[model samples]
Target: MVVTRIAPSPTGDPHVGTAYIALFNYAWARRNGGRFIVRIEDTDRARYVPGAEERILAALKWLGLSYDEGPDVAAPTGPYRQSERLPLYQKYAEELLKRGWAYRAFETPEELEQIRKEKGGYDGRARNIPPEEAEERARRGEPHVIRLKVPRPGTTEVKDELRGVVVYDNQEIPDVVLLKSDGYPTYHLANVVDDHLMGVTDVIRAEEWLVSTPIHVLLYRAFGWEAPRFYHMPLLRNPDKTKISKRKSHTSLDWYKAEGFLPEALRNYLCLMGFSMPDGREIFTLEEFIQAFTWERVSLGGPVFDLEKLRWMNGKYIREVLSLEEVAERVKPFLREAGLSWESEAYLRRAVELMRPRFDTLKEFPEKARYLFTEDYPVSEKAQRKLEEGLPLLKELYPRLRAQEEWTEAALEALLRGFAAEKGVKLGQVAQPLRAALTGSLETPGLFEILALLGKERALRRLERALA
Candidate 1:
């Protein structure tokens, strides 16, 4: 079976890069009728943050990329966390040492610094250290790290699915630290052991790891295990064409979620980053995405990360994919966050239905639809300017609208349109001021729709308040 996995380090916020790679691995695995697993690479205890692992899992789940095996979910290859599989790493380290594939180096930091200064880099001086002396120091509990023996002669070619054949000279590759002196397995060793043990057949990760591919290939060969097929996806780029980062852009999944991007919208946005749809359609469901995904369709160039474009796509999802009722329910938490509450589902539903066409994100809903929930929404500076100009017109129309008993969108439109004709002005002259008084802004859905949604009572109250 074709098995794939994404091993994320529990360092900090669940990075968008992790989600990017995870999505690729997940779709590829599911495409081939394979199992996708998520393993926590928490071997680096020093940099590990509390609660990061849970957030990582939560972020993946939020994206709807369910894993077949993970930290919580069990499989034949259980104990998915690298911390729990320490003994296995140690066992593999010993096997490499016994087979002459790795050696223990007792060099102190100071000594290694001097050697690096002299030789320009670590020249594997410890490769020649006597095994008997190495064993003696190990027996005496001396501080040491196990280093992989890179054969200093030939070149290693990595058959990358995306970039084609990538070659690295053996001499250019440094002897990597497989196990640290602190007895914790380094990422290279732990990742290799875990991936092998978990039976991951396809290794899909970001292009940043392309340099380490040769080292991983050598590690697999040293253990006499066939390495998985590699697919190095291109990195996401900032608008300036540099690598995507927190300094340049918001790089966390939590940030995207908090900004009220729907999961389907975010997933759809991410799907188009590197991989192209077969039909070249921008909007698609997750199943359609999975059906069309392939390594050949993935581009090698860095995909531009444009927040404006994402907002446009999200607006498409809001307007096209989600129901009006679903948007209302989805926006409740955001309303509560803004200290707003609603008394009627029908009222909220109508409010959302009117405002849904105006907003791209759920976060925008509460702010845009604020007048529906409360009379205290702040008027923008532009609206205040319009309010100043329309004060007289609003005063004349207020009593007229208050007396009109029909209270329907058609009645409101006819009243406002007839008022515009009687006053010898354009419809906007009447509509703009009415909008500022009603919605605290010039931009909104149809003016009549707002009137119907706001109703006669609340609309007159806001108009009077605008005059006041």
Candidate 2:
């Protein structure tokens, strides 16, 4: 079966980059009827953060990108996480040593730093040591690390599924550390070991790892295992044409969530980073994306992470893609966060439906529609000015409106337009002040929709309060 995996380090905030890579891996695996797994690369003890893993999982869950197996899921080959699979890595490194594919280096940190400063990279001085002497030193409890004995004077071919066969000189590749002296395996060894054991058939990840593919390939060769197919995706770029960074781009998932970006909308936007539909469809569901996914359609150019473009796409999702109930349910958390509530589910549905056309995000439903939920909403300076102009017109209409009991949008529209005709003015002349009075805002949905959703009592009460 086709299988793919995403190995993310649980460091800090759940990154948008992580989600970007996961989306492709997931689409490919699902398209091919394979499995997608997530392996937590928590071996970097110095940077391992508490609760970081949970948030990573939460981000993936929020985006609906699920894994077939993970730390929270089953792993029959012992613990799935790299930190708990130390013994397996230890055994593999020992195998490499016995096979002479790897050697132990007893150099201290200070010595290695000086060596690198002089030689530019590891000079592989440890590779020249006889096995017997090194074994004796190791037996005597000398601290050392296992290093891959990279063969020289040859080129390693990296067969990228996207870019085709790329060649790299083995001389450029260094004797990278496979096992640290602290008894922890570096990411290079752990990743290859875990991917092979986990049955990951394809290695789909960001292009940042393209230069390191040869190293990982050599690691597979040392273990006498078949290497998985490699496809390095183009890294997302900043608007300045540099690789995306926290300094240059909003890199965190939390930031996007807080800004009210829909999970589905962000998922769709990430798909456009390096790949496109032959039919030129910019908006698509995940299922549609999977059905149409292919490596050949993917562009090698770095896609700019544009915030304005994303906000537009998110607005498209709110106003077009999702149904009324979907938007309302998504708005629930934001509403609760804003301490807003509705009397019933139907009221929330109607409230969200009415507000949907004016919002780009779920948070905007609470923010821009504050007057719908609260009487204490602040009227902006622009809205206050609008109130001053519409007040006299409203005073004439209020007594006439209070006497009538009709509250439907049709009834409200007819009443307002009829009043506008009688006063020899446009509908905005009367509705403008009522809009400010009712919502305490200028830019909102049509006056009739707001009046219709707020019902007769609440709508009149707000107008009466404004008139007083």
Candidate 3:
């Protein structure tokens, strides 16, 4: 069976990068009728963050990319976390030692630093030591780390599915430390052992790991196991063309979630990073993506992490995909966050339905629709200026609005249009001031729609107040 897994270290907040690779792995495994696994590589205890693993799992679940086998999910490959499989790594490292594939390097930090300073890398001085001498030192409990004894000749060929058969000289490949002196396995050793043991058939990850592929290949050969198919995806980049970093980009999934980005919109955006729909559609559902997904469609060039495009696409989903009621319901948390109170579900839905075309995210809905919930919202400086320009028009429109029997949108539109004609002024001259006075902003939903939703009482009150 085609099995794939994404092993993310719990170092910080769950990143969008983690979700990016997980989407690919999940899609590939599901395409082949295989299993997708989520393995926690927490052996590097120094950088591990409490609750980060749970956040990683929750982030994936939020994106609707839940794995088939994970820490909480039981499978034939139980105990999916590497921290729980420590003994297996130790056993495999010892097997390499007994088979002459690895050796204990009794080099101190000072010695290794000098070697690296002089030679630009470790010289493997301890690799040449006799096995008896190494064994004696190890038995005496001398501090040492196990290093992969890479032969200083020939080449190792990596048959990557995306890049294909990349050649690396063994002389250039360093003797990577498999197990640290602290008895904890480094990333190189734990990953290989855990991947092999978990029966992962494909190794799909970011291209940053491309340089380390030869070391992993050597590990697989030393253990006499076939290496899994590897596909190194291109890195996501900022608009400046630099690799996407937390320093430059908001790299946390929590940031997107808390900022009120819809999970469906996020999933769609992440899928577009490297892959595309066959029909060339920009917006699509997950099911459509799964049916059309293939590695061939992925671009090798670094994908731009454009926030503007994400917001634009999110607006499309809001205005096109979701119903007005869904928009209202989805925006409640943002309302509560902004310290605003809704009058009723019907009122909130009416407000959101009119402002749907104006907002790109749920957070924006609260900002744009706040005027509907309360009258204390601040008018923009430009809006205040526009209201000042239309002070005379608002003073005259107030009494007319109060006396009008019909509070419907069509009747209000006719009233404003007829008044604009009788005054020999353009419709905007009347509507612009009315919009600024009613919503405290020149930019808002259709003026007639807002007037009707606000009704005569609040509408007359705000206009009279703006005139004041």
Candidate 4:
């Protein structure tokens, strides 16, 4: 069975690229009747983000990408979180050391860093150091690191699923540090150790790691073990064709949620990157993705993450897949956050009616629906200028509006129209000022909609303020 896992470091808000990789892995695993696992590769203890582990899990869940094995969830080979598996990595590191595949180096960090600066990436220059001198320094408790002993000059070739025939000379990559001087295993050490231990077949990942494959392939050969099949997918690039970053693109999963992007739309959009179904459907369900995914179908060309395409696809999902009740349910939390209660059935109905046409997501409704909850209407520059004569006319009208027994949309419209007619001005002249005073903006759904939503008490209070 083809078992694939996405091992992400929780270094920050989980990036869309992380999800993009995860989505493809999930599709591949499900497609092939294999296990899809979520593993937290939080081995870089000093640099790990505080909430990153949870954020990664949350992001995957929000995307509806469930895994067959994970930390919170279980797998056959347990201890899914890497941080929790340090003892295991140490055991294997010792095993590799005993096997002569790895060795302890007695070089301090400052000396090693200076060597890197002088010699470029790690090479055999350190190997010339006298064995007695190195052993003496190590015995004296000098800070040192365990380095992997890369196989002598040989070409390591890997068959990539998308980009075929990736070959690397063993001399190019250094014998990597397996265990740091600080007693922590570097990513190079832990990654290979975990992949081997986890029984993760079909190691599908981005091409950026292609250069590091020789060390990984060496690790497998040194231990007399079989390395998982490797496929290095193309990197997602920016408009300038550089490697995309969270700084350049919408990297955070939370940013998508904050922007009111539907989760499945994000899933659908990400699935299209570097991969496609046989059916040629651009927008389809995760179920469809599972049914259609094949290793040969994945695109070798880099895919640009277009925000515009995502928005258009989101609209399609909104109209086709989602129902009014579901939309209301999804949008209701945002309304409540804007200080509107879900319990005000009549008020909510009107607010939703007024906001429905203007907003695609509940998060977008507040700017349009703010008139419903406030006593102080947010006046626009246009509305501010609409009152040419200003407060004098509004002062006279406020008292009459307060004394009226029937406060209704019809009454409000007639009263305002009469004032404009009596002044020998267009209805807009009076209506604009009234809108500014009533809703604090010349732009609103309609004057009647605002008044009805606000109710009499709040409307009168705003009117009195406008008169002032």
Candidate 5:
């Protein structure tokens, strides 16, 4: 049986780039009728982000990019996380050392880096060091990193499933560091060892790691183990053709969640960004990605991440594809978590009903209707200048609105018109001033909807803020 896995380092915010890779991995595994797994590669302990593992799992689950085994759920291999396999890596490093396939180098980090700079990238010092001298350095208890001995000068071919045969000379590769001085193996070593033990036959990931493929191939040779098939997916780049960053594009799942982006919409957007079925369909369900994925169908070119395209695609998924109730349910957990308690069950239910016609996401539904719940709206500097003559206009308007017999949309419109008439101003002059005062936003949902939600007392208080 075929086995494929996604090994993401749990560090910082849950990145969307991870999902992009996982989407392909999951699809590839499903397409081939293989076992799919998620491995937590937390080898770089110093940079590990708190709650990043949970967030990774959460984001993947939301995207419907699931695995048969993961850090959260155990597999037949038991400890799936790289951090949990410390003893196994130590044993493997020792075995390599015993076989003379690896050796200990007692070079300090500064000394090693200086050597690399001076010698033009790690001259074969670790490899050429005599076994007697290496043993003496080991006896002295000097700090050391275990280094893998790459094969002598020859071309090792990496047969990529997509790119076909690619050659790398062994001389270009370094005696790569295996285990650090701290007894923790680097990602390169742990990954090779885990993949070997787990019996993963195919390694599919982003093309960023293409340079390191030769080092990994040599590791398999040193250990006398079979190497897996390697597939390198295209990089997700910015519109300017640079690799996507949070500054250029939102990489964090939480940012999307907070900004009222639906999970399915996000999935649909990312699915279209990179590899796609030959038919050029923009929107694909998770099941469709699995069903339609073909190794040959993937293009090597970096796909530009256009957020405008994503938004349009997201709108299509939310409005035309998913049911209104699904969109509402998607927003409920986030709303509750955001502590938006002003939304009563009845209000939320009503909001959900009104939302589908007006908004693409449940989070957006509240945003469009934000003026309904609160008076503090966003006002621009240009609009803020409109408030210069605001207080008297607002004080006069508040009393009249407070005494209104009906507070419906139509009644509220008339009430505002009355103020415009009495103040010798156009309805917009009175309304815009009141809008800036009540809601900080110079732009928002309908003004009557704002008044209706705030009711008389709250709306009057909001106007008083401008007066004060």
Candidate 6:
């Protein structure tokens, strides 16, 4: 069976990059009727942050990318976290030593201090240590690290599905530490062991791991295990076209959620980073993307994460993709957060329908829809300017408007249109003041639509309240 995995470190916020890689790995596995897993590579204790793993799992759940096996779910191969499976790594490190694939390098803090300046990275002097003597020293409690004995004569080759055969001379490969002095396995050691034991057949990760993957392949060779197929995905770039780096707020999944970016909208947006639909359709659901996914469709260039374009895409989803009921349901929490509520579901749905095209995010709903919901909405400077210009005209039309028999959009539009004609002025002269009076902003939906949604009672109250 084709098995793939996403191993995220519990070092910081659940990253957008982690989600990006997770999306691809998820789609690839589901597309091929294979299994997808999530492993917590939490062996690096120094960098591990408390509560980070739960946040990561929660973020993945929010994105709707469910894993078949994970730390939260049952692990078919073994425990999903590297920290929990330490003994497996220790056993493998010992296996490497027995097979002469790795050697122990003892160094005290004083010797290790200038060790880098003196010998410059081990110098492989430890390779000459007799195994019997090295074992004795280690048994006598001499602190040391197990280093992989990389063959310095030959080159290592790995065929990346995207980049073709990437070759690296063995001289470029270092004899990296497999097990640190504290008995904790390094990422390289833990990663190789877990992936092999978990039955992962394909390795899909970001291109930043490109250099490290060759080292992993060599480790596989040392352990007499076949390495998984590799595909290094393109890195997401900033608007400046540079590699996107960690800015705690910008990179965290919590930021996107707090900003009211829809899960499916973000899921859709992340898909556009490296892969595209064969039909050139920009708007599609998670299931749709999975149906059309193929390795050949993924582009190799760095995908720029343009925030404005994301807003544009989000607005499209807000107005076109989600149902009106779905939007209303999704926006209730945001509205609640802003301390806004409505008495009727029908009333809320009407407000949401008209407000839909005006917003990219649900967080913006409470502000833009304030006039439709409450009487205390803020009036922008431009709208206040319009109000001052129309004050004289509004006094004459106010009484005439309240006397109208019909409160429909058509009735209100004609009342203002003919009133403007009688005043020898354009329709905007009448509508702008009325818009400012009723909605407190000129950037709302439509004048007639607003009048109707606000209905006769609330509409006249805002107009009178504004005129006051």
TM-score of decoy 5: 0.77
What C-alpha lDDT does candidate 2 achieve relative to the native structure? 0.88
1 or 4, greater by TM-score: 1
How much is 339 displaced in model 2, in angstroms?
1.9
lDDT, candidate 1, 101-144, per-residue tens: 89999899999999989999788988887888899999999999
Name model 4 segments beyond 4 Å from true: 108-121, 125-144, 239-241, 276-282, 308-320, 387-434, 446-468
Q: What CA RMSD would you report for each candidate?
A: 2.0, 2.2, 2.0, 4.1, 5.0, 1.9
- Candidate scoring better on TM-score of 2 and 6: 6
**lDDT of each prediction vs. the true structure?**
0.88, 0.88, 0.87, 0.76, 0.76, 0.87
C-alpha RMSD of candidate 2:
2.2
For candidate 3, lDDT tens digit of each residue in 78-127? 77777888888778889999999899998899999999999999888898
Question: Candidate 3: which pairs clash?
Answer: none
Off by over 4 Å in 1: 420-429
User: What are the per-residue Cα lDDT tens digits for candidate 5 across 225-255?
Assistant: 9999998878888887888888878888877
Tell me how far the alpha carbon of residue 398 in candidate 3 is from the true structure, in angstroms, after superposition: 2.7
Candidate 2, residue 426: lDDT: 95
Residue 158, model 2, lDDT: 85
What does the lDDT read for residue 159 in candidate 2? 91
1-468, model 2: which lDDT tens digit per residue? 789988888988999889999999899999999999988989877899999998998899899998888888766545678888889998999998899888999999999999999998689999888899999999998999999888887789889898889888899888988998877988788889999899999999878889889999999999989999998988888887888889978999989999889988899999888788989998985999998998879888988989888889999998887888888888999989999888899998988877777788787888888887877798988888999998899889988778768788898889888999999999988878888888888777878888888788887788888888
lDDT of 6 by residue, 313-336 (tens): 888888887899999998999889
> Model 6 shows how many backbone clashes?
0
Candidate 4 whole-model C-alpha lDDT, 0 to 1: 0.76
TM, every model: 0.94, 0.93, 0.94, 0.81, 0.77, 0.95
Better of 4 and 5 by lDDT: 5
